[PDB]
RNA sequence: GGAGUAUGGUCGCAAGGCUGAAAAAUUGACGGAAGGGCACCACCAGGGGUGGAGCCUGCGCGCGCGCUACACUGACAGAGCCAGCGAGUACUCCCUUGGCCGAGAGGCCCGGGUAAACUCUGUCGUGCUGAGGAAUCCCUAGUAAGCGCAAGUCAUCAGCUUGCGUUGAUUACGUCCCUGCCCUUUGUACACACCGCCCGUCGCUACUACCGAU
């Protein structure tokens, strides 16, 4: 912001910082530097960690119990399993982080919703 | 008139006219039920004249 | 995929509501910035909201750059506007009839990057699925009444806005024998638009003119053989498709080759074809008091 | 104003009534009746709407804990003919094990 | 063929789009019609001034095609409905 | 309407989409890819370049490289 | 009082007719030959409409577009066995003979005008009891076509629109030969590799000199 408003490099990095953080999900818009200033926050980081965002996608009831699940290891990302409960889920990966292969959890879900394929 | 059948929006109406001719004169007619629903007459219905 | 498109589309909605709040703000911010250059005094609330002044000092550059036209607004079109070629499919209704199928062939020809598709036995939810698994620009329907088309239904995919319009005054391609008509050129036609003077007019022109390929920009005003027109009066946009040869720097001759439409758009939804539970943006309001007096577009 | 009006000005209109050769079809709906209909219909359609909201944006993969402890909807094939997608809340009875049934039957 | 090609070749036949000639070609031409040619060409290659069937005749009969004009027809009629 | 078209095609303008290049944003001059005070401002500018490079390293590297 | 914002009215200009309807070009105008890419508006294998008769919306008596009929893929009797979409306190085809109880306005009662399909079992057998020319137009995978069921969504649409499900083939799936349409012969990236100055008629420009008036 200290840079004078009319500059090319200012314009380029306003856009760059904004769209990059937005693709890291920590924001909510992509057009306001004041929002970067008094909005970008370690709390927003934590709410883009892994267990918090699996509560948001509704994997599990409370983010404590979500931590317990992903520590036992039912929670996959992409194609890998994940143990590190700080695997910062960027916005392109919130759509993917799902349940693992041989999970008693996934079979429980299929039990309740009555399709429980044993194959 | 008085409605003959009633679908969701489009309603047929029967006992208002004596001919398709009279209707197609009153094409696009600004019609209005008592309850205050507005509406429009659009085509004469063919099988009961 | 499917969780992804649900993700992005709702994020578009929520960011719109965000833009509502912040543009209500920037209205005030606008008056501050103008005053600095002008030295004309200002509203005292604007003079003394402190977070506003500091936030000005951060967020100047957006306002001046928008004044410059340096950026195009956040849009379901601005992501991929003139970069990549929009491919478009045209489909008929469920059980088509033959004259309708010929007319659909005609408007496939008018577009240059299209395919037609026999609809056949296909749930329209799964036709939307075919869309979001072949990354189309645009689905397009047709509905006939009795041999004569009545309505088209433009959707912009992956998730964009949909126009839905009646048609009238249609002529086919196929009322003229092939001894006089002929195969029409698949060249990238120009587009012209006359009389769209609402912001809603610019919405509908946006959803129209992002159908066609990008022209190459070097000599486009000089080259080119084929011109498509959209003109509008009494919110009945009339569209013709013409082909031309330039006989002089002072004279030119046109030939009329496409189907002649008038369509009047009666549903514009930021929301695709299946989602009947979506947010409409302008519907055609008969039955009201002065829905006949006023016009949009 | 209100003091610039006659009493016969202040007088009322009465609503007409259904033609007596037509009382078969119920009352003659006027604006009171209409709006009460549309009140209820707007409300119930908005509730349907918010429901389809939740069903479309439904994550295919959630997991609470009632799922281990309730009895689900299932589907047409699962329950078969007594299927309505609502889920069963036990009225409050339970399988009585033997000794209790004995004491009860003794009292009986 | 295409509308475009048939119009280009008809106009080159009509000499109104042919290449910029010389003075000598101008002298030869001045040394050695097109109005009605152009008017008929226009009426043709904007065929939607009128209706025809696409089929041609259900029965050939030999003894010695525009089918009427929607635009002039509805125009004349609207003038009468005015008057 | 034929009149309007005539006017525009003579006075050639269309409201067409064009083919804007994908690399205006990063190659604002569009070089060919083959053979070929103000000091205070320049120092601050290269400075912000350095800050940005380091943060983007940390940003990709934090995000675990999906970006 | 000041600052804005509107709103209307006033005022001045714009508001004096050698005149009587129907270019730019060192960059341009137009071809041609070769070579590529494509397309059920191209080739090729087939399929399928309409076009024959009746019905009628539409469009301009003509014209198609939809609906019906037309027989071996038959008719009658049984047996069995399958869908998906739909829930607004809301839904009706008549209109009429009589009579009931209705001082009168009505309400009665009696008369008259969750599937087709498919499989199996058995009975009889081409019997006005005739599947649509030349043309033309469309179609390459849950597609052609068949079959019903529902809804009736502010534009259109019940003389029908639109959905959902049901059964589901043949036939090419290649080639630019015909028809065409587009694009190369400039640029936009360099290694190996290869290619190796396309062609025509005019325009515009600089210069050169010629010809003939003033």
Curated annotation (Swiss-Prot), chain D:
Disordered: region residues: 1-24
Keywords: Nucleus, Ribonucleoprotein, Ribosome biogenesis, rRNA processing
GO biological process terms on file: rRNA processing
GO cellular component annotations of the record: nucleolus; small-subunit processome
Basic and acidic residues bias spans: 15-24
Places the protein is found: Nucleus, Nucleolus
Function of the protein: Involved in nucleolar processing of pre-18S ribosomal RNA.
Subunit composition and interactions: Component of the ribosomal small subunit (SSU) processome composed of at least 40 protein subunits and snoRNA U3. Interacts with snoRNA U3.
Similarity comment: family membership: Belongs to the UTP11 family.
Designated name of the protein: U3 small nucleolar RNA-associated protein 11
